[PDB]
Design an enzyme around this catalytic site. Structure first.
Site, PDB file in Angstrom:
ATOM      1  N   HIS A 103      40.937  20.042  30.152  1.00 19.23           N
ATOM      2  CA  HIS A 103      40.921  18.626  29.820  1.00 19.23           C
ATOM      3  C   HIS A 103      42.111  18.263  28.943  1.00 19.23           C
ATOM      4  O   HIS A 103      42.499  19.047  28.071  1.00 19.23           O
ATOM      5  CB  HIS A 103      39.605  18.254  29.112  1.00 19.23           C
ATOM      6  N   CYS A 161      42.752  12.965  33.703  1.00 18.41           N
ATOM      7  CA  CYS A 161      43.058  12.943  32.275  1.00 18.41           C
ATOM      8  C   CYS A 161      44.532  13.241  32.001  1.00 18.41           C
ATOM      9  O   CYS A 161      45.129  12.642  31.097  1.00 18.41           O
ATOM     10  CB  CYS A 161      42.174  13.944  31.536  1.00 18.41           C
ATOM     11  N   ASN A 182      38.995   7.325  33.948  1.00 22.11           N
ATOM     12  CA  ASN A 182      39.156   8.563  34.690  1.00 22.11           C
ATOM     13  C   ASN A 182      38.708   8.359  36.133  1.00 22.11           C
ATOM     14  O   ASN A 182      37.646   7.782  36.386  1.00 22.11           O
ATOM     15  CB  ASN A 182      38.351   9.679  34.023  1.00 22.11           C
ATOM     16  N   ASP A 238      41.324   9.429  24.731  1.00 20.74           N
ATOM     17  CA  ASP A 238      40.582  10.382  25.545  1.00 20.74           C
ATOM     18  C   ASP A 238      40.050   9.588  26.730  1.00 20.74           C
ATOM     19  O   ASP A 238      38.910   9.114  26.707  1.00 20.74           O
ATOM     20  CB  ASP A 238      39.455  11.043  24.737  1.00 20.74           C
TER      21      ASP A 238
END
Lengths: 343, 76
Positions: A256, A15, A10, A273
């Site tokens: 997110h 994201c 990130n 993730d």
């Protein structure tokens, strides 16, 4: 790890981009075409194709989380831009359009419509005069209504349902002037890789509020769409296999993104993730992303984009990609960049 | 020329536009009719998100073309 895949770092608020990149990376046929783009004359940090080639190469070869700063540099972005929260389907539409344009006039021209483009037909029938018309249009994803629908099937039923054109929306029937009419849509073709955008938002004109729709909405592991075609193919049924679930947590203004994928199309699922890739169960990827009520202990987490692959195309689209598929001119340029960076 | 816009409810509305209209102009007409501020609108047509500063003719949009109106779910 026990997962076999690497995450993406990130940059601050990237994201949405990481979730898209994994989604595209595991579209193997697209990845191989990106590898073949003639980037040898391109500027290292201006070329979106070269940056994608680099991201994909490192996703395919690295053992630590992969960085994206050269990709965002190639977008023309600076530090501030990597802190702006964004919509993943917006980035998908912009990025794929850009790559498709860059493939024109090259040996992979047409790859992106081949993988993602379908055609639909919209037909109009006037009610008080004998006047009808149709229009056939391409699409690269489908916007599916969610509000008040239980599942993907009811969304497609509504999508093709006949609609009245009256009042302030009368149809322009040429020499008959504005006319009350019926309008319907049907699908002519569905593409090998089907991108579905769930319309999880509404606007309230009374308070100028964008509002996210977190209602429960069910989607299946296997998706038969033949009944929504104008004409079916007995040798090629429109049966689709769930590939990816791009998940948003939060509201319209921020939150997110993660993506769940079973990269091989074999039902073995992982959660991506940003830099953490973890094994997960089918139910974690699917039923847990139906939305609905939260507990009092984050919030408002549900599927936003779905990727399905046509069963008949699964072995061509998810075809294995090896180092024999990467031009050696490309790997050399990437080593050169790495060595110049460590300077 | 009359085009269609599929709104956020999935309903079809009509819009009276010209090929020379910019995307900004079209978003202003959608605001007129649907009430959504232009800065929140995104229009999808044939796989492209229509860009402010371009015209409808730049995308070969014609009578009875359908644009798809969407919002944003921003995330970091």
């Amino acid at each position: 790890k026990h997962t076999g895949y690497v995450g993406l770092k990130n940059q601050g608020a990237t994201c949405y981009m990481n979730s898209l990149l994994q989604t595209l990376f595991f579209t193997n046929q697209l990845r191989k075409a990106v590898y073949m783009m003639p980037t040898e004359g391109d500027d290292s940090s201006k070329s979106v194709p070269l940056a994608l080639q680099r991201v994909f190469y490192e996703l395919q070869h690295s053992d630590k989380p992969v960085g994206t700063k050269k990709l965002t540099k190639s977008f023309g972005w600076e530090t501030l831009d990597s802190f702006m929260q964004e919509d993943v389907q917006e980035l998908c539409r912009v990025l794929l359009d850009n790559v498709e344009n860059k493939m024109k006039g090259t040996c992979v021209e047409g790859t992106i419509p081949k993988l993602f483009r379908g055609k639909m037909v919209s037909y109009i029938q006037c009610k008080e005069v004998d006047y009808r018309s149709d229009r056939r249009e391409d699409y690269y994803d489908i916007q599916l209504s969610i509000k008040g629908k239980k599942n993907i099937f009811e969304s497609f039923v509504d999508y093709v349902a006949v609609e009245q054109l009256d009042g302030d929306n009368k149809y322009d029937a040429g020499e008959h002037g504005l006319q009350e009419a019926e309008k319907g849509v049907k699908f002519l073709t569905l593409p090998p890789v089907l991108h579905l955008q769930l319309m999880r938002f509404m606007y309230d004109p009374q308070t100028d509020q964008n509002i996210k729709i977190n209602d429960r909405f069910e989607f299946p592991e296997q998706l038969p769409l033949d009944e929504f075609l104008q004409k079916t193919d007995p040798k090629d049924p429109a049966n689709y296999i769930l590939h990816a679930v791009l998940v948003h947590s939060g509201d319209n203004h921020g939150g997110h993104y993660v993506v769940y994928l079973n990269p091989k199309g074999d039902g073995k699922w992982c959660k991506f993730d940003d830099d953490v890739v973890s094994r997960c169960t089918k139910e974690e990827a699917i039923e847990h992303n139906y939305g609905g009520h939260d507990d009092d202990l984050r919030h408002c987490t549900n599927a936003y984009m779905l990727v399905y692959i046509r069963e008949s195309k699964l072995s061509e689209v998810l075809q294995a990609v090896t180092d024999h598929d990467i031009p050696q001119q490309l790997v050399e340029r990437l080593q050169e960049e790495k060595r110049i960076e460590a300077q | 020329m009359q085009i269609f816009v599929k709104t956020l409810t999935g309903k079809t509305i009509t819009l009276e536009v010209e090929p020379s209209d910019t995307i900004e102009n079209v978003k202003a007409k959608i605001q007129d009719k649907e009430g959504i501020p232009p800065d929140q609108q995104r229009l999808i047509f044939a796989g492209k998100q229509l860009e402010d500063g371009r015209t409808l003719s730049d995308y070969n949009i014609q009578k009875e073309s359908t644009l798809h109106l969407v919002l944003r779910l921003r995330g970091g």
